[PDB]
Amino acid sequence: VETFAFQAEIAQLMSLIINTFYSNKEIFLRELISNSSDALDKIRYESLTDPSKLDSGKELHINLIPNKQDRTLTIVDTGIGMTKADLINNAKSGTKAFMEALQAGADISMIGQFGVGFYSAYLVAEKVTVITKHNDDEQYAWESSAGGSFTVRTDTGEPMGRGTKVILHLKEDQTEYLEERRIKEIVKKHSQFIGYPITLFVE
Numbered sequence: 001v002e003t004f005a006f007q008a009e010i011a012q013l014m015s016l017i018i019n020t021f022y023s024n025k026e027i028f029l030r031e032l033i034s035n036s037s038d039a040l041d042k043i044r045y046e047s048l049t050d051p052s053k054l055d056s057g058k059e060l061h062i063n064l065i066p067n068k069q070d071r072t073l074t075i076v077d078t079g080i081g082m083t084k085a086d087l088i089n090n091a092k093s094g095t096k097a098f099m100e101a102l103q104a105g106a107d108i109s110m111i112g113q114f115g116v117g118f119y120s121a122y123l124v125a126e127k128v129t130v131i132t133k134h135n136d137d138e139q140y141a142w143e144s145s146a147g148g149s150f151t152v153r154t155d156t157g158e159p160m161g162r163g164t165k166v167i168l169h170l171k172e173d174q175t176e177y178l179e180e181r182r183i184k185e186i187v188k189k190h191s192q193f194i195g196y197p198i199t200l201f202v203e
């Protein structure tokens, strides 16, 4: 298990997201779905010149998996995935412009325009786990409960083939994001035009 410190600006952004009074928390789902869509675009693009890239999985989709027992909402995609280098690297410039925008009068819902939309996960989650598998690397698990650090480790769990899984360990008062009707309403409102199938799993 490797422990890393977040770069100062990211730690600051994460503190801002956790501490600011902001009721419109549902925006986290649109940000994660949009990141999944971008990774799916990357694998679809790379597969045109090289079809062997789809050997780790042909289907390009997004699955939303609520688990009331574990209090987790999982966003799974069969996108390009991330290598260990991509995982650790993937923000400093966007983070800076976003803080400045907020002070100027902008709101947390514009987070995606600065390429740091992922951190909106901390509006609803006390801990985020990211499992990823890229064709050029092994399966890795990234994890952070904020507090200025994150861990990275080789994942020993079930192989994914290719893609990224975001496991949101929800805060006690945010269990509405495990409800079928609530998830449906959010996806309809903010992610109506994603160019990939979004399957909401039922329990």
Ligand SMILES: Cc1cccc(Cc2n[nH]c3cc(O)c(C(=O)N(C)c4ccc5c(c4)OCO5)cc23)c1
Pocket (backbone or CB within 6 Å): 032, 034, 035, 036, 038, 039, 040, 077, 079, 080, 081, 082, 086, 087, 088, 089, 090, 115, 118, 130, 132, 142, 163, 164, 166
């Ligand atoms: C811990 C950690 C490290 C890095 C990035 C994230 C953000 C993230 N959230 N949900 C995702 C789903 C994905 O398929 C990917 C992914 O496989 N790719 C290649 C990806 C990379 C950057 C992106 C992106 C897609 O969308 C715009 O920014 C990432 C993310 C989280």
